[PDB]
Amino acid sequence: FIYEPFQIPSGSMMPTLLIGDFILVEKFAHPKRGDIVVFKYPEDPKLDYIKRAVGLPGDKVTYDPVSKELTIQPGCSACENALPVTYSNVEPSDFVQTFTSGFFEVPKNETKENGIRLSERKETLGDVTHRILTVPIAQDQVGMYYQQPGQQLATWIVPPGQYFMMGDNRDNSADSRYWGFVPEANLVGRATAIWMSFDLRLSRIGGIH
Amino acid sequence: XXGXAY
Numbered sequence: 456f457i458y459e460p461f462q463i464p465s466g467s468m469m470p471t472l473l474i475g476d477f478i479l480v481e482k483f484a485h486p487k488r489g490d491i492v493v494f495k496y497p498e499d500p501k502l503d504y505i506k507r508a509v510g511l512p513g514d515k516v517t518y519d520p521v522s523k524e525l526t527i528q529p530g531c532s533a534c535e536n537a538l539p540v541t542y543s544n545v546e547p548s549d550f551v552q553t554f555t556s557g558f559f560e561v562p563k564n565e566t567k568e569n570g571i572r573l574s575e576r577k578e579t580l581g582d583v584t585h586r587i588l589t590v591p592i593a594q595d596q597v598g599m600y601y602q603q604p605g606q607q608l609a610t611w612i613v614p615p616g617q618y619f620m621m622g623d624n625r626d627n628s629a630d631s632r633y634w635g636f637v638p639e640a641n642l643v644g645r646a647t648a649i650w651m652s653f654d655l656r657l658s659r660i661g662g663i664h
Numbered sequence: 665x666x667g668x669a670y
């Protein structure tokens with residue numbers, strides 16, 4: 456297995472990956488659902504993106520922008536079956552976002568002026584659980600989504616050999632919702648570890664949770 | 665290495 460280091464400059468994967476993390480990526484030789492995947496950006500392959508592989512080839516992906524919850528129906532290209540997906544109670548996150556924008560780690564009992572407290576919950580997609588963050592005052596403008604020809608707004612059927620990527624910082628992630636699918640050829644590898652974290656956040660070094 | 669990932 457070949458391993459490539461990457462730095463995380465954006466908050467698109469909060470709280471799983473924070474700005475200032477240096478990660479290791481294990482290059483492929485296929486990603487499973489829920490994998491944190493680094494890939495070459497389709498519109499501009501000179502740029503590398505990191506998102507969660509939320510949709511696999513053949514998946515019917517539906518996103519409710521109000522509840523900010525996903526519905527997945529696998530192997531459907533009159534669908535056959537539905538993937539077990541669960542959501543935990545929404546609770547305050549450790550983070551406050553200011554409104555341009557920036558992220559701060561504020562104590563849950565404290566408040567930051569000109570800021571909004573982000574919400575946190577656990578999303579389970581079949582076998583894998585991870586956290587997502589949501590901005591309580593934000594909601595996607597479905598009209599800005601990438602619309603798949605033949606499909607309704609906010610529903611996508613993942614073509615064979617391609618993937619649907621979504622960030623964990625749900626309201627702060629330029630992902631498959633806006634720019635479409637990620638082709639197999641574009642996949643770089645799977646994120647495995649945090650080798651180093653600058654603000655030094657040595658407590659972050661280890662596995663990805 | 666040390667490239668970025670957005």
Ligand SMILES: *O[C@@H]1O[C@@H](C)[C@H](O)[C@@H](O)[C@H]1O
Pocket residue numbers: 464465668670
């Ligand atoms: O590459 C760096 O991070 C991304 C998110 C920004 O758009 C760039 O300007 C750099 O700061």
